[PDB]
Structure 1
Amino acid sequence: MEALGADVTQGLEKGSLITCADNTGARELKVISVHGYSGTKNRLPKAGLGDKITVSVTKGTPEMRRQVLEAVVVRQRKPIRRPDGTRVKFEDNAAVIVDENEDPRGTELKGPIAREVAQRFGSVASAATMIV
């Protein structure tokens, strides 16, 4: 994919439970895979900012519960680095469900989103409130 224009240190692992940042009817999401990433013996699969992941819907509406959907990491607790060296950490870890073309399945986005996320997924970005 296109450069994030920032250095990331993965804050997630396959199996990590995170927050669903949208009105999709999903509240809790469970990480499952990481698009375009193959690890190495014993290394548990790492997921960080701006990564197209694969998710299992953990909590929510009885229609959305247990659905295998794709999504994008929009916030995380581990510090990610910008060009000027500053670090950037968020309150929680989260991602917004996405479809095949990579357009949000939900309508609006809850909470902020790092500005670096815009460059990889504009359709998600052009639907954002705060872009830190």
Structure 2
Amino acid sequence: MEALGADVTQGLEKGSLITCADNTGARELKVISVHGYSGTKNRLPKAGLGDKITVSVTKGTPEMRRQVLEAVVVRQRKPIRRPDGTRVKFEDNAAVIVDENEDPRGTELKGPIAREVAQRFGSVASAATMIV
């Protein structure tokens, strides 16, 4: 993928439960897989800011619940490093449901998003109210 523009210490693994920062009807998401990733023996697959991930809806509306969808990690608690050396970290771990074209499935995003994620997924960005 296009360079992110910052160094990331993946703060998530397969099975992690995260916030769904949008208005799709999904409240909690469980990480199932990480797009383009391949690990090593015994290593739990990891994902962090900017990665596209396959997810399962854990909490939310009946219609959304249990559906296996694609998403994009927009926030994480583990720090990331920007070109100028500063570390950046969020209050929680969150992702946004996305379609086969990487367009957000929802209409509105909830909470801030890392500028770096915005650069990668523009249509996702053109939904953000706060970009940090």
**In 1, Cα distance between equivalents of 2:3 and 2:129:** 23
SS state at 1:27 partner: strand
Identity of aligned residues (%): 100
**In 1, Cα distance between equivalents of 2:98 and 2:45:** 20
**In 2, Cα distance between equivalents of 1:128 and 1:94:** 13
**In 2, Cα distance between equivalents of 1:34 and 1:55:** 9
**In 2, Cα distance between equivalents of 1:66 and 1:127:** 25
Q: Deviations over 1:65-95 (max 9, x none)?
A: 0000000000000000000000000000000
RMSD: 0.4
SS state at 1:106 partner: coil
Structure 1 residue aligned with 2:77: 77
**In 1, Cα distance between equivalents of 2:127 and 2:26:** 18
| CA deviation after TM superposition for structure 1 residue 15, in Å | 0.2
Structure 1 runs (4+) greater than 2 angstroms displaced: none
**In 1, Cα distance between equivalents of 2:53 and 2:20:** 13
Structure 2 residue aligned with 1:40: 40
SS state at 1:118 partner: helix
Structure 1 residue aligned with 2:130: 130
The answer to whether residue 83 in structure 2 is matched with residue 88 in structure 1 is no
Q: Deviations over 1:27-49 (max 9, x none)?
A: 00000000000000000000000
| CA deviation after TM superposition for structure 1 residue 118, in Å | 1.1
Number of aligned pairs? 132
Give TM-score scaled by structure 2 length.
0.99
SS state at 1:116 partner: helix
| CA deviation after TM superposition for structure 1 residue 126, in Å | 1.0
